[PDB]
Amino acid sequence: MKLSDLISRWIDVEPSKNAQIILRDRYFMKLDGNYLETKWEDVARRVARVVATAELLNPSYKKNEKLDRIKEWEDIFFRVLKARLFIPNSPTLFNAGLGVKHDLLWKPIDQMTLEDYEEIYRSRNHLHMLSACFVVPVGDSIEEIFEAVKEYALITKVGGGVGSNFSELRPKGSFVAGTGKASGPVSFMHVFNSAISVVKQGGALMGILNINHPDIEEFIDAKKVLNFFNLSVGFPMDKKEILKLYEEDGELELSHPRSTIRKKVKIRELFRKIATNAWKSGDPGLAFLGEMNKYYPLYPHRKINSTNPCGEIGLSDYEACNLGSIDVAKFYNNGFVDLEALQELVQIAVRFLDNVIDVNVFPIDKITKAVKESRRLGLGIMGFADLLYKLEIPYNSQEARDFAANLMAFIALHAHRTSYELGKEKGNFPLLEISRYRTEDNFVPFAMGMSNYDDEIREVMKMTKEFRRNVALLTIAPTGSISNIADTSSGLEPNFLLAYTRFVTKEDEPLLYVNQVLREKLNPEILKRIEKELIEKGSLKDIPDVPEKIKKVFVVALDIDPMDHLLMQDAFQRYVDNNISKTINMPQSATVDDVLNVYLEALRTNVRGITVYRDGSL
Amino acid sequence: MKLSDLISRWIDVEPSKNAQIILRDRYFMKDLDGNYLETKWEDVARRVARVVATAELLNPSYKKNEKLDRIKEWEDIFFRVLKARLFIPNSPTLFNAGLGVKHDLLWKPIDQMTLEDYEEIYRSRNHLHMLSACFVVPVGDSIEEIFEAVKEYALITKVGGGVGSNFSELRPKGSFVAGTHGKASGPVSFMHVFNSAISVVKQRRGALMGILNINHPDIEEFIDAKKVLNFFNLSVGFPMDKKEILKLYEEDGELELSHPRSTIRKKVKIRELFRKIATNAWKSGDPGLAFLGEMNKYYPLYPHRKINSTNPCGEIGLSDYEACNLGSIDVAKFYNNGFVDLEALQELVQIAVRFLDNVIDVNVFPIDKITKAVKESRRLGLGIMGFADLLYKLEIPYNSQEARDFAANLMAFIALHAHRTSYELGKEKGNFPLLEISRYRTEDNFVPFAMGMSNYDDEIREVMKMTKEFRRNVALLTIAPTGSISNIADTSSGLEPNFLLAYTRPLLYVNQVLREKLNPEIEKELIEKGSLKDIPDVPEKIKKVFVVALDIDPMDHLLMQDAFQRYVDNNISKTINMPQSATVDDVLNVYLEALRTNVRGITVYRDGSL
């Protein structure tokens, strides 16, 4: 069906009362604390109008027509936004229009003149930061360490999540031209933690240390406060290499350019250390940085050393990335995903995300540059688990994973063809010429190998040798907050729970929530009886008197075994040029051996990183 | 007698074994192997003198066929007062002088020194060649400025400095912050980041100064912050006149707590704020009080520049990005026949001031703004140590009007000749850049301290007028703790009474002057009891004389501070010791007498309180 007509079916559907609480708490703009916005329509309008003002910069538009052209983009943007088919990362919702006079952000589009958009463009203040994901380096000097703590605080203040690889820092007890002797990365990481603890935005930071750093063991056991850090162990070498060393029971030398300190450790003992900690507490994860550089169009002229906090974007030094997600559950139509409307939305969403770069303001000049030059986007999806329920497809099945790979491949195809086109109309990312899209033949920024679309995707990548707006376009984020605004499942995650009682504060209340798809499918009287047990058990699986087909379909996170989580992440990653946010849920009864087995399988699949969460551990 | 003769008396007295251990431990230079380049005090003295003399290269009054002679002459004079331990510079000068320089130039005989040799010492001083103990930086009201100040703390701590700040610009906790739903974290909470920075950058550890002004809305939280600021000394700032605060107090008035970038307001009774300050000091020693207005009253560049903070022990009031190098005279070595040898003292004061001013020239800072602030004002901290031991020798009891009048006259004579030395260096080398906008140039009768307790006052007034025309330094004097340098010097610390006459250091130690004076058949009861007061058959004249910190009541501590502060242009480090039985009201009474006298700040420590 036409995107038009899907917009119609959603545009007058208001957010649930749950989404509305989140919105007034956090999203609706407010001196001294009065609401300038009271409906999601209000958010959609302000954001639509501000992202649309980037069309001022379009070299392919003549001065006459510019107002026409801009209003057209405002209205579609507004329509997909209000309908909740696509929502950008939170910072876009929070910060769009900051610094702009309130008479201009909600004004009827009727009364918008071309000098009103020009006024919007030039009044964006130092806080107009619309992107979620950042990486900064932490060089081996007191100067560079503390510039980086400053950078963390500046990024955080404006609503960014930031990560670093701390491996440049020489090991603890290393020689310093001082003085003393080097504190080592773990103890400097406390300064960064201490800083975010006082910069209150309203897991937060990613800190990575590489597997061959002499302080790695300390780093693995560091969270056992550091409470604001997610930690990952970095593998800048090739996955295959580490797999083989493991398989032969080999040893790894721990060493550092600027220390004499060296140790040999068995790779299995180190792995088991990691797995034991992650079994107990969820940290540290694994970051396969070598796998990310493998698919990075600019490597080695540039290099990915770290991810942002939730691990879904691998970023070079000072790079940033703005994200946004399509609710694929809204795309269900009579046993099929409606690809005609999904194609149009991918097109709109890539333009939306690329225009955000043009109206974004960063607090550090190096970040502004790093971004101008690459124009990395993070288009993803949410509502995927719910889409499966509608299609009657068990999440833990080869059917779901093949469908997942075809769906992502379709999106990757039309995302990169939109980038092709934007490069033609607006100009190429400055670094096209030195990227693998130019200097190579047959370069594809992801593994593929599970879809009919692979040839067409090869064709697209070849075409983008010539025209290409963006270094990379796709990610799957956690969507913790935008999936709640949109009333849908998060990211590619299964639903964690089908039913739970939530609580309204009123003024001076328990109100049962049931998954809406489940509500529409199960006999309402079967629902009434089983509800009690479903809430206590957290699952339908052991509930007598629930039909078997329902149940096979309506699995939640802990019904789905760890390998079936991991393989779903593999299926998506084959068609995503950045990385993926996936929690590998494990049952309380999983051992440290089971965790190691996940890591081992992880090395053989196409995943770019790993997070495990064992039920009841924390 | 001539300083040269006084030197000969001290030059070959070797540092004690206690002093030598300190020296080997952290002052003797080592090579990459951890092998010692220096093994003797003499080597530090040669190294430091040589390095500080090389500043004479920049002297615009020397030829052309003259410079090498004049430099070796300064090097020789510096070397000899150093070796004798008559004057010692602040520790970082000891630690860091000569860094970057080849080792064959550093300890080479003065007589084999060539002009090119000095030129190469000077050119090869590295980024670590940091020779000053005392820093102040601003902490402005923005995340940007806060974390730039945190970077500065780091960089300063790394190269060996102590830094202080006034946090009062930061908006109170809970203030509106544009563009977010979070509230301002507030000064106390942001201090946590400074503490955590210093916990991870080794200096031999730096305590920090943190000040919040009495009229800041978070002031009560600040007073209570120390029961994770374990690195901070904390002082309450009083930017208003001390008269005004004393009055407000006596009249049982109110203080408006407010901030220009917050709606958070409150009114509090001054007596009640003072009582909380006093209760916390009684418990733990913190917070002390910093009379910033009194400091600014005597600041020659006020109001264009202002002092908002001290460095960590409070002895220097510093304007933003300003730093200061210190040095101390061991006055105890100037005793001669029932008198202080003022002939020798005047000469060492002249030498010390030059030595201190030359340090600015070979000093290297890690921030450009500090470099500029120091070039522009050339502030010095010439002090004394050995004061209590010098009183022992003169047979004067520390807790007597006699001791305070003696201290006033002694500090007055030092101030006189230091400021006269500054006039002359002004003339010979050029004035400090800011002289002409300073109150030595723009006022008449500006004197940078209260005087009032000496025969020297009128002569001091004349020298101040003279320095309308020539003046090298904005200010010159201080009294420092001298916590390490009085140890190296084998003498009592700063102006402080000895804390104890005998203390285990399995070691064990007896004050040298008591030792050369007490009938050597007269000790067990002193190491335990801590005093001579209640040993009987110890003659009552030794005893009146040989008093320690806790024999001297709080007002005699405080009036001793006053006596010195009237002739010191920067500030003074003095702890007001109190007996364990003192009450919160006894503290408040110290506070009130402090506000009436000429002291520039207060630190109390009440015995057994930790």
Ligand SMILES: Nc1ncnc2c1ncn2[C@H]1C[C@H](O)[C@@H](COP(=O)(O)OP(=O)(O)OP(=O)(O)O)O1
């Ligand atoms: N004083 C200190 N305390 C603790 N750690 C320090 C200290 N100084 C330096 N470090 C650590 C921080 C960095 O990881 C590393 C090097 O710092 P720094 O010495 O500033 O770099 P640099 O490149 O200027 O000097 P270098 O000549 O030693 O390499 O050692």
Ligand SMILES: Nc1ncnc2c1ncn2[C@H]1C[C@H](O)[C@@H](COP(=O)(O)OP(=O)(O)OP(=O)(O)O)O1
């Ligand atoms: N997110 C935050 N959490 C806690 N404190 C904050 C936060 N943001 C700012 N502050 C504090 C730090 C300072 O004391 C004060 C102002 O910081 P900042 O907003 O960077 O100043 P600014 O000069 O940029 O203000 P403005 O945006 O009003 O021009 O508020």
Ligand SMILES: Nc1ccn([C@@H]2O[C@H](COP(=O)(O)OP(=O)(O)O)[C@@H](O)[C@H]2O)c(=O)n1
């Ligand atoms: N405290 C935090 C934690 C993560 N983040 C960032 O938010 C990014 C995406 O998270 P998400 O998709 O759940 O975000 P929204 O649903 O809130 O848009 C993460 O990858 C982090 O970079 C942040 O800004 N602040």
Ligand SMILES: Nc1ccn([C@@H]2O[C@H](COP(=O)(O)OP(=O)(O)O)[C@@H](O)[C@H]2O)c(=O)n1
């Ligand atoms: N651990 C220390 C001790 C003193 N200092 C600085 O030295 C000043 C003088 O202290 P002091 O006179 O006892 O020090 P020394 O020169 O004797 O070591 C203090 O106010 C600090 O600014 C420091 O930075 N770190």
Ligand SMILES: [Cl-]
């Ligand atoms: Cl020191």
